[PDB]
Symmetry: C2
Subunit: 89 residues, 2 copies
């Protein structure tokens, strides 16, 4: 239901997926890829879901800007329909 990401520790784009896997309790085989996140967003994850991304800045820069694609996947699920709330603190 509630997920929390602190760009403080996401030193890498793999850090990002390792965190989402636990936070969103994705499946054990989570392939750590936008494709696997989408599918997970479209079938495994249980909504409502409110995601708080603390300090999106760091997590953005310390990842070659690879955090913005992940966020867009979330922003896309919401679009298609998923009940997601995203707090960019």
């Amino acid at each position: 239901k509630k997920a929390v990401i602190n760009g403080e520790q996401i030193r890498s784009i793999s850090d990002l997926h390792q965190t989402l896997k636990k936070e969103l309790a994705l499946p054990e085989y989570y392939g750590e890829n936008l494709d696997a996140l989408w599918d997970c967003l479209t079938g495994w994850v249980e909504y409502p879901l409110v995601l708080e991304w603390r300090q999106f800045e760091q997590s953005k820069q310390l990842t070659e800007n690879g955090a913005e694609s992940v966020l867009q996947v979330f922003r896309e699920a919401k679009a298609e329909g998923a009940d997601i709330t995203i707090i960019l603190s």
Copy 2:
């Protein structure tokens, strides 16, 4: 401090600026343009500011996708430094 935009009514990109003007209590001469928003974000508006954008979907589509540039201005102010919180509900 707290601003609320409901893409439910932002039928146009001018609706967007008419709303920001009131919600953020921008100046009477607010020119309704990204340039005037930026400046307003960089001197007039008082922080902390928590901006809630309900149903960003509609407000995105029913505006030729012109809502994304506005949001990026806010995402930029935050970047440069502004104390802004963005809830995309």
